[PDB]
Amino acid sequence: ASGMIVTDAGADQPIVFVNRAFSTITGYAPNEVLGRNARFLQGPQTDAATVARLREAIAAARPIQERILNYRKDGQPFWNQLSISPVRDETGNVVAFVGVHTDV
């Protein structure tokens, strides 16, 4: 099953919802991640060039897909196949971001 993260659109995109699969994949309970930016999943061997593309996509509110090295709660590194899309109202305002983790 694929993980899903919803964040607010502004003020550093705090997590507001995660699905069951997110907890299975990352080892984090919802209470541990709600209200935080998802970047806590990144660690010492995470590729800075990949993080830069995520940073610019979020700032522009455009969709992005990256393979990024993340770390489970227990500290084990895993490859996260991450796809992020902005959620917009019909006037073009960004309401939220949705992240999907296509990880086995």
102 part of the interface to a copy of itself, by CB under 8 A: yes
Q: Which residues, 21 to 60, sit near ligand FMN by CB under 6 A?
A: 37-39, 41-42, 51-52, 54-55, 58
93 part of the interface to a copy of itself, by CB under 8 A: yes
Instruction: Work out what residue 17 binds among a copy of itself, ligand FMN, none; the CB cut-off runs from 5 to 8 Å by kind.
Output: a copy of itself
Long-range contacts of 37-44 (CB under 8 A, 24+ apart): 37/7, 37/12, 37/13, 38/5, 38/7, 38/13, 38/99, 41/70, 41/71, 41/80, 42/68, 42/69, 42/70, 42/71, 43/69, 43/70, 43/71, 43/77
18 part of the interface to ligand FMN, by CB under 6 A: no
70 part of the interface to ligand FMN, by CB under 6 A: yes
Burial class (CB in 10 A: 0-12, 13-18, 19+), 91: exposed
DSSP state at residue 41: G
Give whichever of 33 and 75 is closer to a copy of itself, judged by the CB atom: 33
Q: How far is the CB of 28 from ligand FMN (least distance, A)?
A: 11
Instruction: List contacts with ligand FMN (CB under 6 A).
Output: 5, 7, 13, 37-39, 41-42, 51-52, 54-55, 58, 68, 70, 80, 82, 84, 97-99, 101
